[PDB]
Structure 1
Amino acid sequence: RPEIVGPEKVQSPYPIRFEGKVVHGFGRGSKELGIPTANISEDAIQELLRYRDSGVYFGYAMVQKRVFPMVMSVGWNPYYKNKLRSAEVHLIERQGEDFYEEIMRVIVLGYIRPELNYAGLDKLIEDIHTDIRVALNSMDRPSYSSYKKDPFFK
């Protein structure tokens, strides 16, 4: 796996901008597993991500008026046969209280990788850490970092 992904400059279809409310998941205490992920309300991503690749994306996101680099996993709801998109976001290097029922604004800037067949907790944790390291490296580039001041965040 490379330590950086995507073109030097943001390229279509990015940036993809959207907002959704942070709601609970199913019970996977990610927060305690040291890798807290915020589930986005399903109503906000159904049509928008329906034809986008499942996997891990990166970009910026804002909640409680603060902006953070982030990674986002996009998959399908396993509880229903009717294809239902799901998206969960992890704000990178954030310190603060929880933000359930809060509106998060997201700006997707690039794709990291497709979803891997679940191979256990340890592996999942490793992949997330690598994803974070790659996200930060990828947004170190000017064309990307400038979106941290995008009007959508104003």
Structure 2
Amino acid sequence: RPEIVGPEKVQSPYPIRFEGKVVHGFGRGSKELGIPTANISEDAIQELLRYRDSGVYFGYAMVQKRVFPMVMSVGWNPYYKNKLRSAEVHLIERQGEDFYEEIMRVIVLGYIRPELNYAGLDKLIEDIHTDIRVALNSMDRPSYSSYKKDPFFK
């Protein structure tokens, strides 16, 4: 896997800006895996991501008045046969308490990869760590890092 992805400069459809309240997930908490993920209110992403590819994206997100680089998994609610979009965000290198019910503002800047066939916990953790490394490397480029101060995070 490459250690950096996407064009040198942010390109359409990015940036994708949206906000939603953080809600509880579907059970199996990533907290135990050392990589907590914030589930975004379903009503904030159904149409917005309906035609976006499933997989891992990267960008910046703000919650509790703090901005962080992030990775986000876009998939489907595992409890319904009818396609219902789901989006879970991991705020990179964040330290703090939980933030359920808080509004999270998200700015997606690029795509990392599609869903990978589950190959075990070890492999999953490795893939997530790589996703994080890739996100940070990709956002170290000026066109991307400038979004950490986007007006949307005012």
State the TM-score, normalized to the length of structure 2.
0.98
Query: Which secondary structure does the structure 2 equivalent of 1:81 belong to?
Result: coil
| Residue of structure 1 equivalent to 2:116 | 116
Q: Which blocks of at least 5 consecutive residues in structure 2 are unaligned?
A: none
CA drift of 1:29 comes to 2.2
Structure 1 outlier segments of 4+, above 3 Å: none
CA drift of 1:150 comes to 0.3
- 1:32-64 Cα distance to aligned partner (Å, 9 max, x none): 220100000111000000000000000000000
Aligned-residue Cα RMSD (Å) equals 0.6
Query: Which secondary structure does the structure 2 equivalent of 1:56 belong to?
Result: strand
Structure-1 separation of matches of 2:38 and 2:119: 22
- 1:61-108 Cα distance to aligned partner (Å, 9 max, x none): 000000000000000112111100000000000011110000000000
Query: Which secondary structure does the structure 2 equivalent of 1:2 belong to?
Result: coil
| Residue of structure 2 equivalent to 1:80 | 80
Query: Which secondary structure does the structure 1 equivalent of 2:116 belong to?
Result: coil
Q: Which blocks of at least 5 consecutive residues in structure 1 are unaligned?
A: none
State the TM-score, normalized to the length of structure 1.
0.98
Structure-2 separation of matches of 1:26 and 1:150: 31
Query: Which secondary structure does the structure 2 equivalent of 1:6 belong to?
Result: coil
Structure-1 separation of matches of 2:112 and 2:80: 26
- 1:6-37 Cα distance to aligned partner (Å, 9 max, x none): 00000000000000110001221211220100
Structure-2 separation of matches of 1:39 and 1:30: 11
Sequence identity (%):
100
